[PDB]
């Protein structure tokens, strides 16, 4: 099977003057750079909307576009805004750190000006409606966001009007009439998102560059889905989670993870023929070229923290109907370009899930040198072709960081195994080895390609301070870094 490689960089980490990466010029420059180095894949994070904490895996909707990624420049070149509208409206102090606090604050006059100008165009409504016909989910997400803003950006569970919380049709007809202009705002911003995003995906595809999108297993409890389709979750009459999502402690840290997402009533799914999941996967394979389903473990056995928790260890391992779901997807959708994220808590039910799909799974080389015997299943000599290998992912340390926190016997052993040449930064070491593996695809974390320090980690699971904030200086993508990436891509036979 044809070998290949790709780069792991979220749209947020692109550089720019808007305080956050955009579907704008530097995105097209990033594509240009991927074709320079004969890459195959661009892996991004999810493009969904974000909450407090700025995680895209706890989202107001499973399909809506994060509006922070809309580009003001592309919007100016359209006749919708001008640039005396965002020239010197500085979004953030440090270029290589996003400040999400108040960036939603600062984009809003600008986006509103653009939506007001888009609607006054004479063909406006027949373009917007022609859009809503292909993405039919838009309007009720837009009403969700409007009602949320009316109640002061308060969670769905703590709104004030219990009638609207459970969508009584008189209350609904009142809110959609009383708030029709702020709703149209959110419809139009979704139209902007999709127009710009599919422009970028088309540029990428026609240069031979393919996009690996991320699909979060769970949505947040503060969601248009918990609102319009509560029968998918274990919730009560006032729509609060009976049990929440998480993961228990494993052998390298004792407190585990509490996530907060609602839990699935997988029985309603099995009965409903997994309708909603077929729709998620279908819109995923249209949004992307390769879909990466997060937390594959959750389709065999998910961890279910009850209410009245004190830590996340107060839960259980519940059964999900993985086999049936994926047979249904195969039958109804054909076979599809999915890669499965199967890290952690692997038991033979999960290994059967994988074997039954034939999707590639993951190999995170950073987990595979903690045991100097060589027996770790994440050590390079145990990889097979049908896997996607990473140095780390966005939840692991950057390689420069991982290398600090090693037993000096573990350091010695790792420098042995990988044949580190003296006077050589170990990010280039690790990446040489990663690309030498028999894996069909290997992905390089744009942090480590530029040799960035421990500060640059994208996520650190089970915290909220300072996450999803890394951006990359254009100053740091020296011709030397690019030449290094092209070299490892040619030497180990993974080009184009
Ligand atoms: C990523 C993973 O690391 C730790 O778990 C185990 C490794 O994944 C295993 O392969 C093996 O080496 O044992 C490790 C335990 O020491 C950690 O305990 C897990 O919690 C962690 N996985 C969680 C994090 C995710 C972020 O993507 C989820 O994808 C994953 O489903 C969670 O379980
Ligand atoms: C929303 C959580 O996202 C992350 O967990 C991800 C994981 O990183 C992915 O690879 C797979 O999906 C899970 C979620 O589906 C974070 O690791 C996790 O910390 C995030 N939750 C944070 C946000 C809140 C807000 O209430 C807290 O409740 C939660 O405990 C906190 O960790």
Residue numbers in the entry: 2 to 497
Quote the original article.
Amylomaltase (AM, EC 2.4.1.25) is an intracellular 4-αGTase that catalyzes the intermolecular (disproportionation, coupling, hydrolysis) and intramolecular (cyclization) transglycosylation reactions to yield new linear oligosaccharides and LR-CD or cycloamylose (CA) products, respectively. In the present work, a novel AM from the mesophilic bacterium Streptococcus agalactiae (SaAM), with 18–49% sequence identity to previously reported AMs, was characterized. SaAM is phylogenetically grouped with AMs from the mesophilic bacteria, but has a similar size to AMs of the thermophiles.
Therefore, we determined the X-ray crystal structure of SaAM in complex with acarbose to gain an insight into its thermostability and catalytic mechanism. We found two ligands present in the active site. The first ligand is an acarbose molecule that had reacted with the catalytic nucleophile D295, cleaving off a glucose residue at the reducing end, resulting in an acarbose-derived glycosyl-enzyme intermediate at D295. The 4-OH group of the non-reducing end of the second acarbose molecule is around 3.9 Å away from the anomeric carbon atom of the glycosyl-enzyme intermediate. Therefore, we believe that we have captured the pre-transglycosylation step of the catalytic mechanism with the acarbose molecule resembling a non-reducing end attacking the glycosyl-enzyme intermediate. The alkene moiety in the non-reducing end may have caused the 4-OH to be in a sub-optimal position for nucleophilic attack, thus allowing isolation of the catalytic intermediate. The interactions of the enzyme with the 2-OH and 3-OH groups of the non-reducing end help position the 4-OH for nucleophilic attack and also block the 2-OH and 3-OH groups from reacting with the glycosyl-enzyme intermediate. Thus, our novel structure also explains the regioselectivity of the transglycosylation reaction.
